[PDB]
Design a protein around this ligand. Structure first.
Ligand SMILES: O=C(O)[C@@H](CO)OP(=O)(O)O
Ligand code: NA
Ligand code: NA
Length: 436
């Protein structure tokens, strides 16, 4: 048609925010000599067996085996050719062409990282050549033209990592992530300011307790002091909330990502909730969370509180706390529609952490979110531990109408750029009268 069609894709090995290679894709379109868009894939700290296969070179002489030249070559030689001449206005067809080209359930022929990077860049290109905001382009793809026409938009509530334990830190605290959430009913610019101020105060509090090194940050910008218990962590966070001038349980709420698979022993069936000290059954773990919420009633969400296949544990956790708090499946689901269907039917949990690159394309990720939306459960659009300059998940969370984003502390460029993109979106929505 020559109007808004793909001329070619060009792949490139770049560095992600952890300094490891990842795939970046340029899209050429409309006969234009310079790319109309560029986006890149994120990367988690680990990739398992129910997720899109992240294709790495394994050449120990480059990037300690983590190069992505093979995946990049698949962009240039296969995936590019599969979308050449196709319209940038139909994201579903573009994503299906990528899926079909690879032809493997786990995307292990061409590489999930190549496919996600192409999906991101092609969606970014489609919005660019239509001279429209990316979240609008994604909203139209998610809802269809008829529901999109008069659609209004909401900004998410951010779940903001500010303190880390587990594998991240040197203490015996095993819960991996402690987050703050600002109250829902206020402008997004005030949500951002609130969590940024709490984050600054926590850093100063920790630097007073332990000196300058205590303000060094982990991969997602959170602090990693040496702590023993979740109560210690939550008490520091509550202190920072107060120093910022906010009220715990009114202005600022708390959330956990236990990453509990990391401290579960499947032979003993015990959770090592305090390193080399305390070992709990599934049932005792649920009771532990119940009492932690009693002591800290501002806790409104717990992610991966039980191990990824401890389905009897999850059923009970959701039985006992599901009416009060979000129970977020991350490892529980790995953005996998087979698991999501089973978890909805069996009532494992009541929310999904959505990682597009775990499933592959944006379209595949939208179907997963739809299943959750369809039963009144919550979608939290998530970063990965290795992020890039692409801010697409900010446009995605608004475009699909999900209530929450989880994209790091208010520090490090690959985290704050997502908050800044949402600040831009909020202004655009206000200016055009699209704010719901
Ligand atoms: O566990 C998670 O929610 C994400 C980041 O917080 O981790 P990773 O990308 O390493 O899977
Ligand atoms: Na540790
Ligand atoms: Na997680």
């Amino acid at each position: 048609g020559a109007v808004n069609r793909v001329d070619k894709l060009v792949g490139r090995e770049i560095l992600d925010s952890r300094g490891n290679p990842t795939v970046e894709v340029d899209v050429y379109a409309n006969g234009q000599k310079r790319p109309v868009a560029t986006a890149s894939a994120p990367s988690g700290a680990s990739t398992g067996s129910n997720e899109a296969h992240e294709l790495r070179d394994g050449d120990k002489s480059r990037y300690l085996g983590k190069g992505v030249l093979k995946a990049v070559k698949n962009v240039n030689d296969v995936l590019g050719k599969a979308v050449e001449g196709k319209s940038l206005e139909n994201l579903t067809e573009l994503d299906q062409a990528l899926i079909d080209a690879d032809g493997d359930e786990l995307k292990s022929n061409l590489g999930g990282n190549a496919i996600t990077a192409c999906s991101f860049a092609l969606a970014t290109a489609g919005a660019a050549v239509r001279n429209e905001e990316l979240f609008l382009y994604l909203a139209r793809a998610f809802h269809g033209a008829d529901k999109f026409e008069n659609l209004k938009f909401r900004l998410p509530t951010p779940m903001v990592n500010i303190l880390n334990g587990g594998k991240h830190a040197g203490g015996r605290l095993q819960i991996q992530e402690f987050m703050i959430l600002p109250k829902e009913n206020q402008p997004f610019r005030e949500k951002v300011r609130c969590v940024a101020e709490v984050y600054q105060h926590l850093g100063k509090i920790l630097a007073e307790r332990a000196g300058p090194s205590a303000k060094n940050v982990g991969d997602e910008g959170g602090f990693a002091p040496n702590l023993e218990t979740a109560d210690e962590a939550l008490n520091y966070i509550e202190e920072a909330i107060g120093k910022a001038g906010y009220k715990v349980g009114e202005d600022v709420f708390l959330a956990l990502d236990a990453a509990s698979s990391e401290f579960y022993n499947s032979d003993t069936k015990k959770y090592e909730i305090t390193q080399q000290k305390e070992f709990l059954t599934s049932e005792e773990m649920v009771e532990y969370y119940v009492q932690l919420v009693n002591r800290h009633p501002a806790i409104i969400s717990i992610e991966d509180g039980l191990e990824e296949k401890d389905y009897e544990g999850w059923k009970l956790l959701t039985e006992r706390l599901g009416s009060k708090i979000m129970l977020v499946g991350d490892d529980l689901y790995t953005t996998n529609t087979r698991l999501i269907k089973q978890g909805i039917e069996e009532k494992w949990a009541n929310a999904l952490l959505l990682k597009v690159n775990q499933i592959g394309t944006i379209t595949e990720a939208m179907n997963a979110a739809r299943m959750i939306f369809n039963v009144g459960q919550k979608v939290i659009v998530s970063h990965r531990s290795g992020e890039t300059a692409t801010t697409l998940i900010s446009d995605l969370v608004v475009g699909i109408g999900a209530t929450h984003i989880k994209t790091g502390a208010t520090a490090r460029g690959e985290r704050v750029s997502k908050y800044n993109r949402l600040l831009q979106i909020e202004e655009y929505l206000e200016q055009h009268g699209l704010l719901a």
